[PDB]
Paper text:
Here, we present a new pipeline, SIMBAD (Sequence-Independent Molecular replacement Based on Available Databases), which can be used for both contaminant and brute-force approaches. In this section, we present three cases in which SIMBAD has been used to determine a difficult-to-solve case owing to the unwitting crystallization of a contaminant. All cases involve the crystallization of a known contaminant. Although the targets were ultimately of low importance for the structural insights that they provided, their solution prevented further misdirected effort on the part of the researchers involved.
Protein A was produced in E. coli TOP10F′ cells, overexpressed as a recombinant fusion with a 6×His tag and purified by successive metal-affinity and size-exclusion chromatography steps. Mass spectrometry (4800 MALDI-TOF/TOF, Abi Sciex) confirmed the anticipated identity of the purified target protein. Crystals were thereafter obtained by vapour diffusion after three months of incubation at 19°C in 600 nl drops composed of a 1:1 mixture of protein and reservoir solutions in a sitting-drop setup with 90 µl reservoir solution [0.085 M Na HEPES pH 7.5, 17%(w/v) PEG 4000, 15%(v/v) glycerol, 8.5%(v/v) 2-propanol or 0.1 M HEPES pH 7.0, 20%(w/v) PEG 6000, 1.0 M lithium chloride] in the reservoir. The crystals grew in space group P1, with unit-cell parameters a = 69.34, b = 90.14, c = 114.76 Å, α = 107.10, β = 105.60, γ = 95.98°, and diffracted X-rays to 2.93 Å resolution. Initial phasing attempts failed using molecular replacement (MR) with models displaying 20–30% sequence identity to our target (the best hits available in the PDB) as search probes. Ab initio/MR phasing strategies such as ARCIMBOLDO also proved to be unsuccessful, likely owing to limited resolution. We decided to optimize the crystallization conditions with the aim of obtaining crystals that diffracted X-rays to higher resolution, as well as to apply experimental phasing methods. Similar crystals did grow in the optimization plates after three-month incubations from 2 µl hanging drops with 1 ml reservoir solution in the reservoir, indicating that crystallogenesis was reproducible, even though new protein batches were used. Mass spectrometry with a Quadrupole-Orbitrap hybrid mass spectrometer (Q-Exactive Plus, Thermo) revealed that the E. coli catalase HPII was present in an ∼1:40 ratio relative to our target in the protein samples employed for crystallization. Even though catalase HPII is a known contaminant that is prone to crystallize, the P1 crystal lattice had not previously been reported, escaping a PDB-wide search as demonstrated by the SIMBAD lattice-parameter search.
Numbering used by the authors:
A (entry chain A): 28 to 753
B (entry chain C): 28 to 710, 715 to 753
C (entry chain B): 29 to 335
D (entry chain D): 420 to 502
The structure:
C-alpha cells in the first residue's frame, strides 16, 4: 500500500470549502447527488479500487514499469503488445478542440419550472412545476484554445443541454444579449479577425490586435457587442455572477398552434459581478484556470450555481412595433419595453467524473429544439443551424456523436439510421427504411398534438425573391451602443473607455485606431473624446459635429444593462484572505471566522510559509497558502487580524498583497496593530471609506466588512488608485 | 397497418430449412439461444416495435416523407434539422474496409474443452471441461473488397474471438496450414501483387493476373501456398467444410513455466468439401453471397457449424528435429510426424443482429493472447503483431475500438489509459497514472501465477547480432509443394494442373508464364509438363533434368493433406433440387422428402414459374424457385420425380439444369419417365435410376451424397457442352 | 479600403520589434531563400489582384450575405457558397500534439565546420560547404497549443534537417536528461504532469498533487525535476537556452566503426533565464512572449544562432 | 468530409480547378496551400481587401442566384402535382 496510513489521500465525501480537501470526481465527492441523467451514466462509469491492472482486452499486467527487451540492457521487442497498446492509446488521446468556445467548464444539475407554461408552449419540460429536467451546462470563452486562460477579456458562452422527456433541447447562449454580426455568412470572417493572426498565431485569448479592430472599423454592425466586450461584462468574476442570453428571437408554439416570439434569459441568483482589467489580466498569469476552479470548488462546497430562466415575450402582431428588427441579433430588447418573465430555476449541483469524457466530448447545438419551440428567420440563427451538426462530424469522429454517453437522450430514440464510425447501438429491426411492411412500419411517425406529438414547423408565411441581401431594417448600428453606454454608471463608463484605450494601444497600424475613434464619435462624443485623448488623437471638427443616434423607442437609458446600477450583491460563496502572523490574536480570529461562516463567505489563511502557526492561546492554525501562492487576485476582500504584526510588517509580499487588493478596489479590514499597514496604501490617519479599521475585530468591524462585500468593490476609491505603484 | 393480415411478413422464431422463411436478425430468429457474450450485448440492442420514429436527439418525427420548404413547390430550407440529421447520418455511414480479408461472414457461438489441459497450459479457457467460452467467428476471403464475391479462388480466413475469463484471445488463422511469405516486411509487396493492379484496379477477387504471377515467379517461397490455392482448397463448398490453421508455431506455457511449441488446427465436423472451378466461377455470378448465405441459413436451420480445436505439440527440445524450420510459416508440420491432438469443440449457433455493428466493426488480432500462451520468433508472426493494432486506429476511428460492443471483453478491464476519439468509459479513478498513492495504487499489477495471474513473457534465450537477414534454414522452397502434390488424389492433381493452366492463360506477358513453369519443374516434372502442355510451352532439357526436391522427414506423402483421399462426408445440411412437373407422381415425392428429412438433407422444389403445381393426387406443391432462379450451382444433388415429364422434357432450363449438375460431378436421381433425361445430357457415373423413387433409390442417392461428388465421371466431362 | 498613406503595409526589410506590423516570412524577407523554402513555392498562394472564389474557382459576388427567400426570409439549402465557407470553417481544427502542443517555429540553415567523414558517413556532415536547410520548432511540454509560453516547464528543441540522403529529425529538449528511464512509463509520467483528469486543472503547471505524487514514488525523476525547478525551467528566450538530444546515439563511419554520441546545441546569444515571479506574471501579461520574441528577432535580423 | 478526410478535398490533385481560386478559408486536415495573405477575413484594409468580390456580369462575373419568386408557408408537404 502506497496510500498514507492516516487516509489523508482521500477527500471527505461531504461538502467542504475551497482548499480544505483535494478536489475529486463528482461521483466520489458527492455519491448521493443524483438525477435521471447522472443515474443513466452508471452503465459507462468505470471504478478502479480492488481491480487488477489490465490491457484493454482484459489481460492482467504483471510489470507495468518495463518494456519487453532481449536482455535487461537490450533492444525493445516488437512483440511487446502491452507496451504498444499503452503507447498507442496515449498517442491517440487528442481530438480536435471546438473551432470556437474551445475553453470551457461544465457541471451537471437540474431545472424545473415555477408554473405550467401550457398556455404559451406545448414543450413538455415547461408543462409541470414538479417535472424535473436534468441539465448539463458548459460555460466558455470564445476566442482562446482549450489551453487558454479563463479571465481573458472576451464574450462568454453559456450552453445548457436539457434532457427532456420529448427530446434534447440545447440552449446555446452567451453572457451578452446580442452578437457581433448579423448574417452567418460573415461568421468565418469575424472569427478569423478576432482569432490569432495567421502568420504567427498571436495573440491568444485577446481581441487586442490589428485584424480584430480592422474588421470592427469596417463593419459597424459589430459595435454593439464590442461595447459589451470592452465593458466589465467582458471580464466576469465567476460563471456564477454573469447573465445568460439566447440572443435570437425564437418562437414558442402552444397546443392551439399559436406562435409567440421569445428571447431567453438566465438571471444569476448570486448577482452580477465582474473583475477589473488589471486584475483580470494578471489573473490569466497567476491562475489561468480561475473560473474552472471557482465553479468546481463552489459545487464541492455546496455553493451551487443557481440561475433563473426568464422569457421576454412578444405577440406575433407586435413583430414591427420596435425601432429595431426583432430578427436582428445585433439588437437587444430593452427590459423597459419588454420585461423578463420568470419561468423556472436551474441548479448546478454536481461536477463531472472525467473532464474529457463528459465536458470535452459534449456537443451542444441550437438546432436541437423540441415540440413547443421553433426558429425565426434571424439570419445568424439560420446559419448556426447548419454549422453545429457539421462540426461535430469531425470533432467527435462521426455521425454517432449522440451515442457518446454525455450526449445521449434520456428519453427513447428509434429510427432507421444505421452504421457510421463507432456505432454503439445494435439495431434488431428487420427494416432499415420506411414505409415498410416487414416490421409493420415500426418505428412509426407521430402526428403533431398537444403532448407527445411529432415535430411540425410553424407555418410561417414566406414571400420574396431568392436574394443575397441584408434587410434595410438591419442597417442601424449606433443607437443600441449608445443606449448601452448611457445605461452605465460613471465608473462603468470609465472602464469601457479604458478597455477601448488599452485594446487600441495594441493596434500597430495607427489608421485603424483613427477609424475606430471615428466609429465611437457616431455613438457618443464623451466616449470618443476620452478614448481619443488616451491615444493622442484629436477629433476633427466634422467628428465633433456628428449628430447622436436616435434613442431606442424613446429610452435614454435602461438600468438593466448595467452590472452595478441596481444592487443585487450576494456574499455567499465569496472568499476572504486572512493574513496571519506568528502570534495571532485568537479573539480577532474567532470573531472573523464566525461572522464569515454565518454569511457563507469562505476564508483562506495565508502566511509567508506553509505548515502551521500557533495563536496567542495555543490554537494551531493550518496555513492554506503563501502570500505569493494565493495572491489577492483570487479573493474578494482582505482581513489582517492583530497579533505580532512585526512578523509581517516588513514582508514585501504582505505589503504588496494589500497594495494589489487596494488597487483592485477590494474591501480591506485592519484590526489593532494591523492599522500600521495603512502607510503602504497611503491611508490618512482619519481613515477612508472602504478601509475597515478598529482596535479589535468585533461584530461592528465584521458587519462593516460584509456590507462592503455586498457592494462587491469600492468604486469610490477609483480616483485614489492611480497614485499607488502596484 | 401495412403488414399482411395473415402474419406472413414475420419469420417463425424456430429452426426452419433454407428458403422456408425470410431470414432474420439472430435475436429475433433464435431468442432463446444465449451465451455470456450475447447477454452482455443486451445493453446496446435496440428494438423497434411500438416505438415512435425520432431524431437521434429523441424528437418525434411527424412527417418522414418530406423536406421543409417555402411552399409545396418551393425551395428546401436550411432550418430543416430533421432532414439534415437524416442525410448527414446517411452521408457518413461508411468506414474503411479491412486492408485484407475485407469480404467476410460471421456468427456467434461457444467453445468447450474435452478435458483440462492444465499440464501443458495455464490458459484459463482450457483449464476445465465445464468451462464454456463464448466466441465470435469471422470467415473471409483475402484479396476481394467487402462487395466482392464469395466463391472466388483464394485463401480463406478463419478468425475466432474467445471471450475468456482472463482476456480476449483471438485465434486469427486461414484455411491452409502455411502462408505465401516468410517475413512480414514483404507483406505489402505480396498483397499489392495479388490485389487489383494499380493503374486500373482490375481484377477483383482474382490472382489470375500478371503482377501476382510475376511476384510468385521471383519469390519461390510463395510456391507452397500457391499449390494449396490452385487446388480445390482454394474453392470451398462452404465455410462449414474447410479446415482452419493458426499457421505459426506458438507456445503453450504451464504453471511451472514449461514451454511447449504448438500449431493450432480446426477440424470441420461436417467434413472437407470443395466446389469445382467452373461451378465456383459461375457461382460468383449467379450468387456472389453464396457462402455468407449458406452460413446464415445453416445456423437458422439448426445445422450449426461445428469445429474441433486440435493441437500439434512439439517439446522445446525437438525444435531442430525436422527437415524444415518450425519458425518458417511457408512450412507445414505433417500430421504423419506430429499428430493433431483433439482439444475441444466450437459450435456456431447464432447469427448477428446487425451485420455492420457486429461483423464489419469486429477487430481480431493475433497479438491478443492470454496468460498460458506466448509467441515465437516466426518472422511473419512477429510483424503481424504490429499491424493489427495499427490498422484498427484508422479502420475503427480511434484507440477506443475495444469499446465497440462486439469487441468488448466479458471479463474486467481497468487501467490508466484515458481519452481518445469516441471514449465511452467514464473513469472515476482520481489517478490516471501509476505508481500512485491518491488511489492506493489501484488498479494494481498482478504477479504471474497458476491462475488469475499477470502476463509474463517466456524468457526465451536471445543471442545474435542486429541483422535484417533471412535464416538459411528458411531457404528451401520446393519440398513442401512436392509433399502436398504427391498427397493428392489423381482427380485433385488434375484440378491443380487446371488451376495453374487457367490462371497462367490470363497472364498477358508470356515470359512470366514460362518462369512459373520453370518453378513448377523444381517441384514435380509431371505437374510442370501437364501445365506446360496446356500453355503451349515445351520444357528444356535443363528443366527435364532438375533433381526433385528432398522428402520431408522421409515422407513421400501424407493423406491428411488431401480433401478427399480419406472420406469424411456428412450429408446433414446439404441441399437437393427437386425438379417438378405439372402432374408430379405424389408417391415418388412422399418417398423422396421422407428419406431426405430422415438424414437432415434439405430440398428445394423447382419449376418453370413460381406459385404452385398440383400433384396426381391433388396435393398442392409450393414452388421455392425457378430452374433459372436457383441453378444447380446452389445445390448438392438433383432429383427428378416421375409424372408428366412431357411438361419439362423440352424445357431448355430443365435440361441444362441436369447437364450443369452432371458436368459439376453432382449426384442425379431419375425416377420412372424422368430417365428420358439421360439422352439429352449426351449419355453413366452417379446417375440413380429406377421405375419409382423408394427406399433403394433414395439410399443410393444418399450414399452418393455422402461421397460429395462423382469423381469417376471426370474422364469424359471435357466433351460435354455445358 | 487601405489608407492612402500606405501605413497598412510593413516594410520588406529588417525592422526592430514594434516598428512595423509583423508579416508572413515570404513577404517580410522575400530575398531570404534556401532549397526548402524554394521547394515550397509550388504551394504558396498569393492574394493581391485576385478575385474571391469558392474552392471550386467560382467567383463570389456578395460575400456578406446568405441566400434567402426575401431580405428578411429563411436561408436556403441551395446556398452552396455559404455551406462551403461554413463547412471549411467548421472543420479547421486538427488534434494538437499529445505533448509539446505549444510551439514556435522558424526556417533556417545548417553548415558543418569541417568534414566529419572520419567519424560518420552522414552526408550532411561530410563537407563544410554543404548547406542543409532546417525547420526548427521550440516548445513547452505540458500545456495546450493555447497555453502560455513563460511557464515553468522543460522546453522542446526539434530540428528537421532536409539532407540530400533523407530527413534527419534531431528531436531534443533544453535539459540533458529526461524524467523517466523506460518508454513504458511515458503515459504514466505525462498523465501525472498533465491537468488532473476530474477537472482538467492546472494548465502549463507541474505544481499539483499528481505530479509530485509520481515524483515522490519514482526517484528516477529527481534529476530532470532539479533542472525544471532551477531557472532552466523559465528561459528568457528560445535564443538563450541550450539544446540536447538526451540519448546516446551512434555515429557510423564508412569503415563501419561505431562511435557513441550525445548531441548538443550551444546558444551563440548565451544562456539566460527569467526569475519566477517575472515568468508567472508574463504568462498573464503576454502568454505569447516567446513566440513573439522569436518572430520579432528574426524580423529584426537578430537571427537565432546555435552551434 | 469523411470520405476524403476533411475540407481540403479540392486540393487532392484530380479535384483541383485549373482556373484561379483564392479566398479567406484556412487550415483543415491535410492543408496543402500555404497562404501568404496578411488577411484571412474580409472586409480588410491590411491587404487592400484582396481577394475581392466581383459583381455579376456577362463574362468573368461573380455568381448571383436567379431571383425566383418564393410564395408559400414553411411546409413538409408533397406538391399534389407530383401525385
Ligand atoms: C447568437 C450567437 C452565437 C452564440 C450565442 C453561439 C454560441 C456558442 C456557444 C455557447 C458554443 C459552445 C457550446 C459547446 O461547448 O459545444 C458555440 C460553439 C460553436 N458555435 Fe456558436 N454561437 C453563435 C453563433 C455561431 C455561428 C454563426 C456559428 C457558425 C456559423 C457558430 C458555430 C459554432 C461552432 C462550429 C461551434 C463549435 C460547435 C461544437 O463543437 O459543439 N456559432 N457557439
Ligand atoms: C499466417 C498469415 C496470416 C493469416 C492467417 C492472416 C489472416 C487474417 C485474417 C483471417 C484477417 C481478417 C480477420 C477479420 O477481421 O475477420 C486478417 C486481417 C489483417 N491482416 Fe492478416 N493474416 C496473415 C498475415 C498478415 C500479415 C503478415 C500482416 C501484416 C504484417 C497482416 C495484416 C493484417 C491486417 C492489417 C489485417 C486487417 C486487420 C483488420 O483490419 O482487422 N496479416 N488477416
Ligand atoms: C528525452 C526524452 C524526450 C525528448 C527530448 C522528447 C522531445 C520531444 C519534442 C521536442 C517534441 C515536439 C517536437 C515538435 O516540435 O513537434 C516531442 C513530441 C512527442 N513526443 Fe517526445 N520526447 C521525449 C520522450 C518521449 C517519449 C518517451 C515518447 C513516447 C513514448 C514521446 C512521445 C512523443 C509524442 C507522441 C510526441 C508528439 C509527437 C507528435 O505529436 O509529433 N516523447 N517530444
Amino acid at each position: 500500500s502506497l496510500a498514507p496510513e492516516d487516509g489523508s489521500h482521500r477527500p471527505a465525501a461531504e461538502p467542504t470549502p475551497p482548499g480544505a480537501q483535494p478536489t475529486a470526481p463528482g461521483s466520489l465527492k458527492a455519491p448521493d447527488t443524483r438525477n435521471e441523467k447522472l443515474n443513466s451514466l452508471e452503465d459507462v462509469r468505470k471504478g478502479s479500487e480492488n481491480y487488477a491492472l489490465t490491457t484493454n482486452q482484459g489481460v492482467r499486467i504483471a510489470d507495468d514499469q518495463n518494456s519487453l527487451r532481449a536482455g535487461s540492457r537490450g533492444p525493445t521487442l516488437l512483440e511487446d503488445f502491452i507496451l504498444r497498446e499503452k503507447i498507442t492509446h496515449f498517442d491517440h488521446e487528442r481530438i480536435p478542440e471546438r473551432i470556437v468556445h474551445a475553453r470551457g467548464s461544465a457541471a451537471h444539475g437540474y431545472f424545473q419550472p415555477y408554473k405550467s407554461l401550457s398556455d404559451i408552449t406545448k414543450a413538455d419540460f415547461l408543462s409541470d412545476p414538479n417535472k424535473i429536467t436534468p441539465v448539463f451546462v458548459r460555460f466558455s470563452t470564445v476566442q482562446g484554445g482549450a489551453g487558454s486562460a479563463d479571465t481573458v477579456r472576451d464574450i462568454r458562452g453559456f450552453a445548457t443541454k436539457f434532457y427532456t422527456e420529448e427530446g434534447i433541447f440545447d440552449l446555446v447562449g452567451n453572457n451578452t444579449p446580442i452578437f457581433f454580426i448579423q448574417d452567418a455568412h460573415k461568421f468565418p470572417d469575424f472569427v478569423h479577425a478576432v482569432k490569432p493572426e495567421p502568420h504567427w498565431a498571436i495573440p491568444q485569448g485577446q481581441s487586442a490586435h490589428d485584424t480584430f479592430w480592422d474588421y470592427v472599423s469596417l463593419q459597424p454592425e459589430t459595435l454593439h457587442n464590442v461595447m459589451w466586450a470592452m465593458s466589465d461584462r467582458g471580464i466576469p468574476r465567476s460563471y456564477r455572477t454573469m447573465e445568460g442570453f439566447g440572443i435570437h428571437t425564437f418562437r414558442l408554439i402552444n397546443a392551439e398552434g399559436k406562435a409567440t416570439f421569445v428571447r431567453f434569459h438566465w438571471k444569476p441568483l448570486a448577482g452580477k459581478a465582474s473583475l477589473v482589467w488589471d486584475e483580470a489580466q494578471k489573473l490569466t498569469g497567476r491562475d489561468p484556470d480561475f473560473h474552472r476552479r471557482e465553479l468546481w470548488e463552489a459545487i464541492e462546497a455546496g455553493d451551487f450555481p443557481e440561475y433563473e430562466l426568464g422569457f421576454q415575450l412578444i405577440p406575433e402582431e407586435d413583430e414591427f412595433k420596435f425601432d429595431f428588427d426583432l430578427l436582428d441579433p445585433t439588437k437587444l430588447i430593452p427590459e423597459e419595453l419588454v420585461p423578463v418573465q420568470r419561468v423556472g430555476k436551474m441548479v448546478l449541483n454536481r461536477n463531472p467524473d472525467n473532464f474529457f469524457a463528459e465536458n470535452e466530448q459534449a456537443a451542444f447545438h441550437p438546432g436541437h429544439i423540441v415540440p413547443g419551440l421553433d426558429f425565426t428567420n434571424d439570419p445568424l440563427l439560420q446559419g448556426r443551424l447548419f454549422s453545429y451538426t457539421d462540426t461535430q462530424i469531425s470533432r467527435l469522429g462521426g455521425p454517432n456523436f449522440h451515442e457518446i454517453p454525455i450526449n445521449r437522450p434520456t428519453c427513447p430514440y428509434h429510427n432507421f439510421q444505421r452504421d457510421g464510425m463507432h456505432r454503439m447501438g445494435i439495431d434488431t429491426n428487420p427494416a432499415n427504411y420506411e414505409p415498410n411492411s416487414i416490421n409493420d412500419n415500426w418505428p412509426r411517425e407521430t402526428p403533431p398534438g398537444p403532448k407527445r406529438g411529432g415535430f411540425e414547423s410553424y407555418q410561417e408565411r414566406v414571400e420574396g425573391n431568392k436574394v443575397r441581401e441584408r434587410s434595410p431594417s438591419f442597417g442601424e448600428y449606433y443607437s443600441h451602443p449608445r443606449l448601452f453606454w448611457l445605461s452605465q454608471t460613471p465608473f462603468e463608463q470609465r472602464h469601457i473607455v479604458d478597455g477601448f484605450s488599452f485594446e487600441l494601444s495594441k493596434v500597430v497600424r495607427p489608421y485603424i485606431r483613427e477609424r475606430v475613434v471615428d466609429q465611437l464619435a457616431h455613438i457618443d462624443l464623451t466616449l470618443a473624446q476620452a478614448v481619443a485623448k488616451n491615444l493622442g488623437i484629436e477629433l476633427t471638427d466634422d467628428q465633433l459635429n456628428i449628430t447622436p443616434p436616435p434613442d431606442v423607442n424613446g429610452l435614454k437609458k435602461d438600468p438593466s444593462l448595467s452590472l452595478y446600477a441596481i444592487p443585487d450583491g450576494d456574499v455567499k460563496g465569496r472568499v476572504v484572505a486572512i493574513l496571519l502572523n506568528d502570534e495571532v490574536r485568537s479573539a480577532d480570529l474567532l470573531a472573523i471566522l464566525k461572522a464569515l461562516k454565518a454569511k457563507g463567505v469562505h476564508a483562506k489563511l495565508l502566511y509567508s510559509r506553509m505548515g502551521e502557526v500557533t495563536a496567542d492561546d495555543g490554537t494551531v492554525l493550518p496555513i492554506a497558502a503563501t502570500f505569493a501562492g494565493a495572491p489577492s487576485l483570487t479573493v474578494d476582500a482582505v482581513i489582517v487580524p492583530c497579533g505580532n504584526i512585526a512578523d509581517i510588517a516588513d514582508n514585501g509580499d504582505a505589503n504588496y498583497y494589500l497594495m494589489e487588493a487596494y488597487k483592485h478596489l477590494k474591501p480591506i479590514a485592519l484590526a489593532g496593530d494591523a492599522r500600521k499597514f495603512k502607510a503602504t496604501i497611503k491611508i490618512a490617519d482619519q481613515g477612508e471609506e472602504g478601509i475597515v479599521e478598529a482596535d479589535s475585530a468585533d461584530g461592528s468591524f465584521m458587519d462593516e466588512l460584509l456590507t462592503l462585500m455586498a457592494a462587491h468593490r469600492v468604486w469610490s476609491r477609483i480616483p485614489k488608485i492611480d497614485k499607488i505603484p502596484a
